[PDB]
Design a protein around this ligand. Structure first.
Ligand SMILES: *[C@@H]1O[C@H](CO)[C@@H](O[C@@H]2O[C@H](CO)[C@@H](O)[C@H](O)[C@H]2NC(C)=O)[C@H](O)[C@H]1NC(C)=O
Ligand SMILES: *[C@@H]1O[C@H](CO)[C@@H](O[C@@H]2O[C@H](CO)[C@@H](O)[C@H](O)[C@H]2NC(C)=O)[C@H](O)[C@H]1NC(C)=O
Ligand SMILES: *[C@@H]1O[C@H](CO)[C@@H](O[C@@H]2O[C@H](CO)[C@@H](O)[C@H](O)[C@H]2NC(C)=O)[C@H](O)[C@H]1NC(C)=O
Ligand SMILES: *[C@@H]1O[C@H](CO)[C@@H](O)[C@H](O)[C@H]1NC(C)=O
Ligand SMILES: *[C@@H]1O[C@H](CO)[C@@H](O)[C@H](O)[C@H]1NC(C)=O
Ligand SMILES: *[C@@H]1O[C@H](CO)[C@@H](O)[C@H](O)[C@H]1NC(C)=O
Ligand SMILES: *[C@@H]1O[C@H](CO)[C@@H](O)[C@H](O)[C@H]1NC(C)=O
Ligand SMILES: *[C@@H]1O[C@H](CO)[C@@H](O)[C@H](O)[C@H]1NC(C)=O
Lengths: 68, 404, 184, 35, 49
């Protein structure tokens, strides 16, 4: 917790540093909270940035409508 | 006979700064005699640690449940034309690299041993993205996106629906769309100018940040208290005094520090409970006054509710309520019913309004006089049982329709 | 577990101290044990009171939820279930309650072309409760939450204003049902 | 009230509604067009 | 009601305990007394909050 571990796979976060887990470029949905949006899970134990959700882009037209 | 839209902003705190303490580090630090003596008191550290971790979990849940109300991040279209409505002061600007709105930047610029600070799970960027996604969903999809899939609904269509939802029929907006757009732009400009005009506007967030920091302070300041002992230094008493006397002095110091720590834990628990209640109220307002239209009067803004927009704010949130104030009134003379051919007549949805000579029917919130016609009136009973009736004629289209 | 703590005394067992020590020193031993256990009991009472206040707040919220979602229908969005709320079932739970929200969730959206109003014979037309929806050739009205096309008829459309102040209008005829009725 | 076309709206056909009954409906302007 | 309690001291009166007893033990006795009174005030403030 908040220790720059230069005197003790090592990854550095804003909440401290994590030892024993790697980093993933892509983002998954997490269930274990850490802090500063860097979640960890078990697919070995991997650490990744949080998924904000589905990146759904909706269109818009001042002349159009959608009815279910 | 006229309407003026006023924008009112309210501030509700969401989550305060998580705080974790260490028992041996704050109480003893380095003296092993204090560490040996602390075991005589029993389990008075695990309870405090569990309490502070539960508080941190509750605050993380509080700051998660107020913003993560959608499962899809909605993207604002690159075009910024919605029918004359300038929406530039609250949408994110790509020029600033922090993805910050001018309102968000203005409100962010107006907010300033053994005590570690746990950073929140949600920093400013993800909550800014959440507020941007909710703003996009409420500007391009109406209130439908809070129920199921988002449907492409135009902004004039959704504001006409919101006008129809407060009992005003949709025959008043489209005649003066430029006027209402100019009024909305002027309201946004004046609320942007007056948001930072007074330093007491952002009262609650500044108050809770002040209370917290000072709280930690007072907890730090108790280390320099003698507590009835010779000195307030652990190494000074042990290396100078007779060890039976040092036992009593360290016992008094440790029980005073434990009382101070328990008082701080109780104060933090009370503050966290109040913050949780305020976060529940803010979540109710977020799930009601943003994801839909609320018919509760004086619940979101001073006036009839139309829509509201969320803005990200550190450790809190500020709402931008858009109200409906029908100023510049003008009075007339009325009657509860109209007598015609021995039978009473009643308005379907409006009220019979007379300007002195003739009679008209109009809506309950706007002066739009219409001729009395049998299509929007119904008959019931006779003319005798009803009181306050007047004698007048009613227009019927079949009389000129049949002979033509 | 706080009973086994010595609290700085000779021993945690009270009977051993009371049968082992004279009252000149048993007085201060009893005093230390009494004040330690009293402080522990005060902490326990404070935590119990805070937890009971939390339970009272949660129970008041649940009572409001069952009063506004079981005894009736609540029109506000996303209070009882994710979507349009119809009604709910209460269920008995040990030390709690569990609701069964029945939600109305639309699906299978379809693209359509709309217009705010239709101008006909110099006067614009506005619907009672629907919206003008066109599939490409003709124009129909339908409700806001389901697709049900109907012919443009003068009973569900009213006139207001002229054809100039309204913007985004389209040109289409309006079917008057009285004209073929009077022709028979 | 007498069931008329002013307070009723037509939809669908008489083949799918469960529990529908046989009844004629009053229509307005019926002694009006012939007089 | 808690103001007039002995709190494990010799007496509960300031003038009775600051005159008869010697100051090396009267200081400790009045320290225990004011500690108990401060605990009572903290508890009363807790229920008030
Ligand atoms: C809406 O109004 C705001 C405020 O005037 C406009 O923002 C200005 O944009 C111009 C051009 O980029 C800048 O030179 C100003 O400095 C901006 N002012 C502020 C304080 O934002 C915005 O462009 C307008 N948007 C629309 C849609 O008209
Ligand atoms: C509408 O016209 C009727 C016509 O009868 C009025 O009824 C009469 O009112 C006068 C004055 O109150 C009475 O002296 C008569 O006895 C009433 N006759 C009947 C048959 O009612 C009625 O008052 C008029 N109402 C209004 C508001 O003008
Ligand atoms: C839009 O909907 C209308 C209504 O169904 C369609 O019009 C029908 O077209 C079929 C195809 O020839 C005809 O058999 C029907 O008689 C038409 N209906 C009426 C009431 O005349 C129209 O084709 C649809 N347009 C598109 C592009 O899908
Ligand atoms: C840790 O220390 C090194 C060297 O002092 C520094 O480069 C690095 O930025 C530090 N870590 C963080 C998170 O600041
Ligand atoms: C809205 O209408 C204007 C009319 O000039 C048009 O330029 C703009 O592209 C339209 N936007 C959408 C979303 O259809
Ligand atoms: C209503 O007020 C606005 C400004 O508040 C003004 O421009 C307008 O002329 C007034 N009257 C009408 C009928 O809109
Ligand atoms: C009342 O309104 C009608 C039409 O709106 C008008 O002919 C009449 O002169 C008005 N009467 C007064 C007293 O203004
Ligand atoms: C409707 O049209 C938009 C833009 O043309 C498109 O992005 C969207 O997928 C369409 N919806 C459906 C259901 O085809």
């Amino acid at each position: 917790q908040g220790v720059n571990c230069t005197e003790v796979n090592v990854f550095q976060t804003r909440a401290g540093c994590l030892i024993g887990a790697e980093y993933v470029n892509n983002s998954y949905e997490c269930d274990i909270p850490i802090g500063a949006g860097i979640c960890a899970s078990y697919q070995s134990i991997i650490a990744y940035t949080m998924s904000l959700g589905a990146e759904n882009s909706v269109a818009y037209s001042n002349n159009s409508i959608a009815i279910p | 006979t006229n309407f003026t839209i006023s924008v009112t902003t309210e501030i509700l705190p969401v989550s305060m700064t998580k705080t974790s303490v260490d028992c041996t580090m704050y109480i003893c630090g380095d003296s092993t005699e204090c560490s040996n003596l602390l075991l005589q008191y029993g389990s008075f550290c695990t309870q405090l640690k569990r309490a502070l971790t539960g508080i941190a979990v509750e605050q993380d849940k509080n700051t998660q449940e107020v913003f993560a109300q959608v499962k899809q991040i909605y993207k604002t279209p690159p075009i910024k034309y919605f029918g004359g409505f300038n929406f530039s002061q609250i949408l994110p600007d790509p020029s600033k690299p922090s993805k910050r709105s001018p309102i968000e930047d203005l409100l962010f610029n107006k907010v300033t041993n053994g005590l570690t600070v746990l950073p929140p799970l949600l920093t400013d960027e993800m909550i800014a993205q959440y507020t941007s996604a909710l703003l996009a969903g409420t500007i391009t999809s109406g209130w439908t996106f809070g129920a199921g899939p988002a449907l492409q609904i135009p902004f004039p269509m959704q504001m006409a629906y919101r006008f129809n939802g407060i009992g005003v029929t949709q025959n008043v907006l489209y005649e003066n769309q430029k006027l209402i757009a100019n009024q909305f732009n002027s309201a946004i400009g004046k609320i942007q100018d007056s948001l930072s005009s007074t330093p007491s506007a952002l009262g609650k967030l500044q108050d809770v940040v002040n209370h917290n920091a000072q709280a930690l302070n007072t907890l730090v300041k108790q280390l320099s208290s003698k507590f009835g002992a010779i000195s307030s230094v652990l190494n000074d008493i042990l290396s100078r005094l007779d060890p039976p006397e040092a036992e009593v002095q360290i016992d008094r110091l440790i029980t005073g520090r434990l009382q101070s720590l328990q008082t701080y834990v109780t104060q933090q628990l009370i503050r966290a409970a109040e913050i949780r209640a305020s976060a529940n109220l803010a979540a109710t307002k977020m799930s009601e006054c943003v994801l839909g239209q609320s018919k509760r009067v004086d619940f979101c803004g001073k006036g009839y509710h139309l829509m509201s927009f969320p803005q990200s704010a550190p450790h809190g949130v500020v709402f931008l309520h858009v109200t409906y104030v029908p100023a510049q009134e003008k009075n007339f003379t009325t009657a509860p019913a109209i007598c015609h051919d021995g039978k009473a007549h009643f308005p379907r949805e409006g009220v019979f309004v007379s300007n002195g000579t003739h009679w008209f029917v109009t809506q309950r919130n706007f002066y739009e006089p219409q001729i009395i016609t049998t299509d929007n009136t119904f008959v019931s009973g006779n003319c005798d049982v009803v009181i306050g009736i007047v004698n007048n004629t009613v227009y019927d289209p079949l009389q000129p329709e049949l002979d033509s």
